[model samples]
Target: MNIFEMLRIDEGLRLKIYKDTEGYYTIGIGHLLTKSPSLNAAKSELDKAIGRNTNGVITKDEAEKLFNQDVDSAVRGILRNAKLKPVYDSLDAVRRAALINMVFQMGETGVAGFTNSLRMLQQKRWDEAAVNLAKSRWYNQTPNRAKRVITTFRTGTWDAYK
Candidate 1:
């Protein structure tokens, strides 16, 4: 309902720069600012958003701020999805945070693909859900973060949250 949430739903999140639907170079939250001479305002917006003159990149801290700004809507996105809602409402705060984190990384559609994991979560099969989360391509792609989320699913305590 908020602006950030609306923008998040509209733009999605991408830490790296990529071309938008119209072939405009864009970065986090559909920030259509790139270093190429074609896009002239890249410097000002880049400096305004992250206080950096650098183009084609944003720091982890900048990404973190962006994430924090959008997290509320990210949670709403998860809760609004019928497929994810049951599981979202079933978990404790830490587990819910973990699920929201997953949704933030991959979007509601991406999390919806985790049918097995969601079912396990809906059934309150905590360990099984953790196992399902671990046995995922997402986990293979980002083991460190996957481990942290899986641990939250299994133990109900997130290091960042606790």
Candidate 2:
């Protein structure tokens, strides 16, 4: 599956303004408007993505554009992080996808905070990596999403892998 498409399934899409779990104003495919340089910048970019004034709503394709933008940023962060890059380069496509999904959900800093789990992954200790991941607030906050990423780390595959 396209990594972008897989992420779409995991992140889910919203057309209207809504509060994320962290209480940020969000729209599109998990795009945090609150995190934008400014809400005005948010509106301008979102409007450009939709090719019209959204006022606050977005289409599926427009959401996709924003998703790809964020996913690319996540990928760059993963590749540039000192600790993660080496381990990330050692991974297979499936495992790489798992890492990308994690960075997408948690950001590079958030994923990097998993010191022991990162070490387990670095050592190719799949089961240990899974074990450490399952014990986190990331798992507690979003079990199903965490389950998919952790399982991919352990099994080195995903539903779309086959």
Candidate 3:
């Protein structure tokens, strides 16, 4: 029923540096992106964000806090997207979280690309929703993570990473 709870769902929470949408070095809930588009650039943002040479290391506590802050901002962006709201608000907490996490990982525009999945969710066709999720390249991309979200949509339970 709330964005905060929904945003806590994780596909995977990376505390270390990883590649982002455009293959830029990223960390902490996809932060270090606006300023850093490369490994070299990431050092500067990390320096600014943490005010020290973390030597490219981030603790889980620090990562969790950064995730919270980033998702808080993402909620604002999701609301501004507007079209995502009605379908977003229609689901149970687990499903809502799945949707929000998808948007967080893929951006609003990218999530919008899951037309069949979105339609199934809006129609409350839980099984079809899960099926639609499996049909995507994303399912093949991350089978276990996608399965968790698919199961959540089908069953309305928060069966994360299991």
Writing each residue's lDDT as its tens digit, candidate 3 over 66-144 gives: 7787776656666777667777878776777677777776678877788778888989999878887898877887676
TM-score ranking from best candidate downward:
2, 3, 1
Per-candidate TM equals: 0.62, 0.85, 0.76
Please give, for residues 33-124, the per-residue lDDT of candidate 1 as tens digits.
65465654665566676766766578666765765655766778877899998888887776777787777667789999999988998888
Q: In terms of TM-score, which candidate is strongest?
A: 2
Model 2 earns a TM-score of 0.85
Off by over 4 Å in 1: 1-65, 159-162
TM-score, model 1 to reference: 0.62
- Candidate 1 vs 2: which has more TM-score: 2
Q: Per-residue lDDT for 132 in model 3?
A: 78
Quote model 3's TM-score: 0.76
Q: How well is each residue in 77-102 modelled by candidate 2, as lDDT tens digits?
A: 98899988987998889899889888
Superior by lDDT: candidate 2 or candidate 3: 2
